[model samples]
Target: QSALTQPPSASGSLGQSVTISCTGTSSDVGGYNYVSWYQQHAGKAPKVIIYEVNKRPSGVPDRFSGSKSGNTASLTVSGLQAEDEADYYCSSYEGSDNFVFGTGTKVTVLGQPKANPTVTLFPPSSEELQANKATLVCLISDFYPGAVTVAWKADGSPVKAGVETTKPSKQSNNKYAASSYLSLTPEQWKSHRSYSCQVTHEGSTVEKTVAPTECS
Candidate 1:
């Protein structure tokens, strides 16, 4: 009933191999043969690597392989190359036209240079104001490694509700970019003196704050 479980990260050196695992209930992974694996580069659409448990789509390299046992499914990358470093996701068909996806795994290639993202905060748009809603945008861009986490805060306290963050999207320069949104009501937006967008890349954290009155 929940998202499939997967390790947050996996890594391998050039010419080596790496394997990522996905776990789900019997009703999904074990009972059916509809499991699939997807590879996603930052800021790019996901590409199907393996479908129907182990079938690769035409034009996919043989270095990528998939297999399943009981409730656990695995995707292996043999002869790891620099281009193979990206995010991996698993999906399974649940009946009633429903499907479940894994929590995504980041694959890192050893010896690659790491770059931190540039963060920017923008106030709500005029369009949202017409709907009586305030939406803050936190743009994270120009990052090398795609793994990042974002949080929204108001007056130093966490704002849990009305927050949505997107997966890293690969840019033309091969860097990554993503955006986080925080929605607020008119009263909530006015009550808070300051709103912040905090982003963590690797272990480093960056925070950008804006006064709500700036948009008023």
Candidate 2:
């Protein structure tokens, strides 16, 4: 199935609330509540702000939340903060071993407000390289209503530099997030270079880096 879909833009006042909707197909959201959300800010990594439809991870404020109905999910950021200006994404398990991410939404914080930012990453472990392409996913598990961007970097430089990353659809989750795939040959994997997954949200950052390692 195609990745999830979200509005291109969403905005709110300094202390007001806003909601972004993620719509998915039957193969994903309609099948389960595995949806997740993320937040991102300019020149930073993305971070999780919500997960599993509506369950907030530990330390995540209740103001950042998720909800679902049929194949459509929604994320609500209440008590908006000035630092909340950024992008948001949503995602869900796409059956098999693959997962999908949303197209992403941008949240604009109109007036000046206090800046309280936080960021987080998921599956905090190293992933072994498999096949010609290595797919890395970063879930922004918490944020107070915002947008985010996910990217892959090699040796501290953006790998998919000129190519446009694919935007996966939002599935049964109210959050916004995305995924990126890196195509590398076995020779490339053998070379000593570092690969990292980054998420930037609400002016906060979360990242994970992995190097070539032998698989069992």
Candidate 3:
């Protein structure tokens, strides 16, 4: 199943309330009660806020609540605080032991906004002259609200294997950085194919491509 659909951003004033919605088909979210919501701050791991449709985990605040209707599940954050400004994501069981995640939502408190990321893609270095595999690095930097997703494409088709993305790393200026590494066989790297890195941030995408000729 494809990823659940979610809005790019949600917002509320301090002490107010906000709701983020995750929408999926009957095969997943609406078919079962195995839905969960997560909250993530910049430079930190995601924490489960709601599980089993609407159950909050231990130590989670009462201000966070969840509900579901038809194909849509909603997470509501009441009494919005500055600290509550972060990214939110939802997931649901798709049966057959499979799970799917939402695209994600960024919550803004008291009119706080977000900063877009700067992306750069680097080709493999020559150190691996005799190595079987080559690695491509995609660097994402200078982003605020700190949540992004990365994808790799070879010759316009998605490439899923050997893609490793690091968690958001905090910068001194309060921005964020992260890197995604794509490993490829030497034959594939020298096959005159175009590989690209696509990054999604704040509902928008930025892509950078690299080719063997540039490095050769």
Candidate 4:
């Protein structure tokens, strides 16, 4: 087949189990064990959890797991937590650099807010980075897979220049965190009404606004 197929939605509750299926062809998933699964939160790129059919990338947690059988592949999330909710996608390599991803599934993580992420802003310390004038960081931690993104704004207007951001990086306990940096002149730093950091994941978004404060 030309592309892989998956259900629209797969869900479970906290402490339960849920699985998503992917269907492809003998030329892809069935032909090679190159079948992979990706998790994508809103405003984020596909995060591969299973590659080569059942291999988890370094730093991946045990709950995010998968496998393949015939032309079908499957992913199962165990002991689901509220943070487990997100959009899931599956992919298969059809030779060359060619590949295909499923439509995506919206995973509803039921029950209490088991866990989310903490977004905080940090100012540049010392005279080193201070040489560039002013700087700040939007830090995200305690977040789950499928990843998330951070954007910046000044007084509610999108701030693109003097901005630098990092893709999702790992932490212990199979968790993740991301950072976004903003550099501004001292005058702009103090005068700018507000500087904001926005985090988006699994169709969910969170934001925090602040001005220059305690540097750490």
> Who wins the lDDT comparison?
1
Q: Which runs in model 3 stand beyond 4 Å of their true positions?
A: 1-17, 22-66, 86-113, 129-133, 214-216
Query: Model 3 — which ten-residue stretch has the worst lDDT?
Result: 106-115
Top candidate on TM-score is: 3
lDDT of 3 by residue, 1-216 (tens): 577888776645578777778888886778677888887874277789999878988977788888887778888788777656777888877667678889878776543345678899888876433665687889988876566678888888998788899977765766778999878677678774878888885466799998875434
Tens digit of per-residue lDDT, candidate 2, span 179-215: 4445445445457477666755444557777666564
Candidate 2 CA-lDDT value: 0.62
For each candidate, the alpha-carbon lDDT, in order, equals: 0.78, 0.62, 0.77, 0.71
Over 27-113, each residue of candidate 4 has an lDDT whose tens digit, in order, gives 677867777887766428657778887788886667777878877888878866754566788887776667878767657654334
Better of 1 and 2 by TM-score: 1
Q: What is candidate 3's TM-score against the reference?
A: 0.67
Q: Write the per-residue lDDT of candidate 1 for residues 26-55, one digit (tens) a residue.
A: 877887778888888742777898888789
TM, every model = 0.59, 0.49, 0.67, 0.48
Per TM-score, what order, best first?
Answer: 3, 1, 2, 4
Superposition TM-score, candidate 2 onto the true structure: 0.49
Residue 73 of model 1 has an lDDT of 81
Candidate 1 lDDT (Cα, whole model)? 0.78
Pairs in clash, predicted candidate 4 = 41-202, 42-202
